[PDB]
Design a protein around this ligand. Structure first.
Ligand SMILES: C[N+]1(C)[C@@H]2C[C@@H](OC(=O)[C@H](CO)c3ccccc3)C[C@H]1[C@@H]1O[C@@H]12
Length: 381
């Protein structure tokens, strides 16, 4: 009847504005605050831009196609709305690929990539993403009916002409969803597994606020770490303490030797006794009331915490939070776009087995994915 139409228009209207509000609020928080324009947060701007377009146009136009059950906007308004919807969502999956590429190279190759992530290279990746999405859809939707010589799409309805064949649509489905999802699936596991994955060499790197050095600097750094341990073994007051410590707290001991020298570390008599006597809680308070905690508090606070917990929980707080963001992003993407692509996968091997009702619900389900992304920004960061 029409009673369900009213309810349909209310629910679809609610999701339209809340997507827009969420996206606009993100952009304002990017243009105002100069502390949110980072490398990874710059890619979240392109996502907020693409999702905003869908919320203001695609969400508003596709609703009328369901309500009136007919397209009454013309032929020039049809091919444009499809181009807008397909380019923005294609730039969207390109943005997600760039986001997933940044974290994968920052973990796998932290020596020759972490110091290469600039704003210049970030602006190009986004710029190219929007251009590539344009070349693949705009001519294929606008200038395909002319190459044929006629418009296959009948008046009153609206759909892409070159995607009439289920075979082509399926091929489009794989390269565009199945292939990026499987890639981002492999990347995410590589990032989540290589979380720790944490040695002394990188431990010092953080405390120094240090950066990735050359290939030769790694040869010298290893010799310095190896020679530091030899000095601890030579030391008659450090050797018994160092030997009783585990591989995690051993490195934390070298952290102080690298800083204050072997002799300076040997000063903490009461602390070293507590470390050998497995009294971690008492040594943490003890090391926090020295001159070392007052000279370099942030460096000490991470070393002291390493002693207390016995884990690398003081050097992964920024990296684990970076994985929680991507986890919330790809989860919403594979839970919404999948039921549509499942149908595309199925529709390829049959004729009439998937109702237009399910194609509509499968279509609208992907729209709300653009709404979760602004929420994931306030749910993680
Ligand atoms: C708005 N949608 C609902 C349409 C259908 C789906 O997209 C797809 O599944 C296909 C590939 O399977 C696709 C279309 C365009 C761009 C990339 C993929 C989700 C989004 C996307 O803009 C389209």
């Amino acid at each position: 009847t029409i009673w369900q139409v009213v309810f349909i228009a209310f629910l679809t209207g609610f999701l339209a504005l809340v997507t827009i509000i969420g996206n606009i609020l993100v952009i304002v928080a990017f243009k105002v605050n100069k502390q949110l324009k980072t490398v990874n947060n710059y890619f979240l701007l392109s996502l907020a831009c693409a999702d905003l377009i869908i919320g203001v146009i695609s969400m508003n136009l596709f609703t009328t196609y369901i309500i009136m059950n007919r397209w009454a906007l013309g032929n020039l308004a049809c091919d444009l709305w499809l181009s807008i919807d397909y380019v923005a969502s294609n730039a969207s999956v390109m943005n997600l690929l760039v986001i997933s590429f940044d974290r994968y190279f920052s973990i796998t190759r932290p020596l020759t990539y972490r110091a290469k992530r600039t704003t210049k290279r970030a602006g190009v990746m986004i710029g190219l993403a929007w251009v590539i999405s344009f070349v693949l859809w705009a001519p294929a939707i606008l200038f395909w009916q002319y190459f044929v010589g006629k418009r296959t799409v009948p008046p009153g309805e609206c759909f892409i002409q070159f995607l009439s064949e289920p075979t082509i649509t399926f091929g489009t489905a794989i390269a565009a969803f199945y292939m990026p999802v499987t890639i981002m699936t492999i990347l995410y596991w590589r990032i989540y597994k290589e979380t720790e994955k944490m040695n002394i060499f990188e431990m010092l790197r953080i405390d120094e606020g240090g950066g990735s050095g050359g290939d030769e600097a790694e040869k010298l750094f290893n010799q310095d770490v190896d020679a530091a341990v030899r000095g601890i073994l030579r030391n008659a007051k450090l050797k018994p303490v160092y030997d009783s410590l585990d591989a995690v707290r051993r490195a934390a001991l070298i952290n102080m030797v690298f800083q204050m020298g072997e002799t300076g570390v040997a000063g903490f008599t009461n602390s070293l006794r507590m470390l050998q006597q497995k009294r971690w809680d008492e040594a943490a308070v003890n090391l926090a009331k020295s001159r070392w905690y007052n000279q370099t508090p942030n460096r000490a606070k991470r070393v002291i915490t390493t002693f207390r917990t016995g884990t690398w929980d003081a050097y992964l707080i920024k990296e684990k939070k970076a994985a929680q963001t991507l986890s919330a992003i790809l989860l919403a993407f594979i839970i919404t776009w999948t039921p549509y692509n499942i149908m595309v996968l199925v529709n390829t091997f049959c004729d009439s087995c998937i109702p237009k009702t399910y194609w509509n619900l499968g279509y609208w389900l992907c729209y709300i994915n653009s709404t979760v992304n602004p929420v994931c920004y306030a749910l993680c960061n």
